[PDB]
Design a protein around this nucleic acid. Sequence first.
RNA 1: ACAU
DNA 2: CGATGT
Length: 136
Amino acid sequence: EEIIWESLSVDVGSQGNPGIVEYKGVDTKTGEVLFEREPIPIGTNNMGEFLAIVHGLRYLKERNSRKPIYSDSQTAIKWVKDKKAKSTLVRNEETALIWKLVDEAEEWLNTHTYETPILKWQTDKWGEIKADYGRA
RNA sequence: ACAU
DNA sequence: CGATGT
Ligand SMILES: [Cl-]
Ligand SMILES: [Cl-]
Ligand SMILES: [Cl-]
Ligand SMILES: [Mg+2]
Ligand SMILES: [Mg+2]
Ligand SMILES: [Rb+]
Ligand SMILES: [Rb+]
Ligand SMILES: [Rb+]
Ligand SMILES: [Rb+]
Ligand SMILES: [Rb+]
Ligand SMILES: [Rb+]
């Protein structure tokens, strides 16, 4: 119903899907950019949305913050819940980097604990997520 | 259908 | 119009 303003919002951005993938996290209240991943030459939207949430988890844990995370990715929310990124992207030489980061993200999920709520950003009611890359 |  | 995913 209402936006939890005391929160972190994340989102992927891409050039092509599959294509060049990046992501970032912002303070929901102010839009301040809190982290940004350097672009990855080939990945999918869902892999980047997944990496963005996991990075958010690590970021908040390191800072002893109990803020929730907003994501507008139904897929990535489920993947993080499952601790398993069910991407269809081919594993080959040119996708090695994104797949390494996804594999390492799952590994982190499987070796650490967190209570961070991971919440659906309700775009239909609230407009676009504040971490969005005005590209779509 | 939904995330879009 | 094309894509990745449930
Ligand atoms: Cl990452
Ligand atoms: Cl919450
Ligand atoms: Cl969801
Ligand atoms: Mg998104
Ligand atoms: Mg977006
Ligand atoms: Rb900590
Ligand atoms: Rb966008
Ligand atoms: Rb957009
Ligand atoms: Rb669509
Ligand atoms: Rb969206
Ligand atoms: Rb579809």
